[PDB]
Amino acid sequence: HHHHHLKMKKYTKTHEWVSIEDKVATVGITNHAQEQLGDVVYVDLPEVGREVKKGEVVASIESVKAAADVYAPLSGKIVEVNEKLDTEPELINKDPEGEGWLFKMEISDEGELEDLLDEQAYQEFCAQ
Numbered sequence: 001h002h003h004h005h006l007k008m009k010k011y012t013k014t015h016e017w018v019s020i021e022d023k024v025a026t027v028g029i030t031n032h033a034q035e036q037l038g039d040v041v042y043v044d045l046p047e048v049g050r051e052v053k054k055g056e057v058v059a060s061i062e063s064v065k066a067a068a069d070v071y072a073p074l075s076g077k078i079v080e081v082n083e084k085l086d087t088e089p090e091l092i093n094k095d096p097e098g099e100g101w102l103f104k105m106e107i108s109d110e111g112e113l114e115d116l117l118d119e120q121a122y123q124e125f126c127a128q
């Protein structure tokens with residue numbers, strides 16, 4: 001038997017998602033979020049190497065009619081950004097929870113994951 005990886009998807013009430021693989025969290029905005037924003041025209045992504053705390057503003061998204069800040073769902077360090085979004089920010093509309101992911105981070109405190117919503121709780125939250 002081999003050491004089990006940690007794999008979960010979590011959500012925030014600010015309509016962000018976090019896909020976790022051991023210590024690496026991939027973060028983006030949910031389908032619900034992109035629906036509210038409309039056609040995305042511009043993304044500002046975080047800088048790789050940046051140390052962030054849960055709640056800090058790490059990205060900005062601008063659409064035709066609106067704008068939203070993206071908050072760090074967890075504490076840790078930015079390790080990768082989705083550079084293709086600088087040229088193709090509409091991938092956020094096309095596939096917000098897949099291809100349109102924003103950044104990946106190495107997390108510092110796994111206990112923070114227990115503060116986020118699971119998929120059932122999030123789907124309920126959106127429905128309500």
Ligand code: NA
Pocket residue numbers: 008009118119
């Ligand atoms: Na879960």
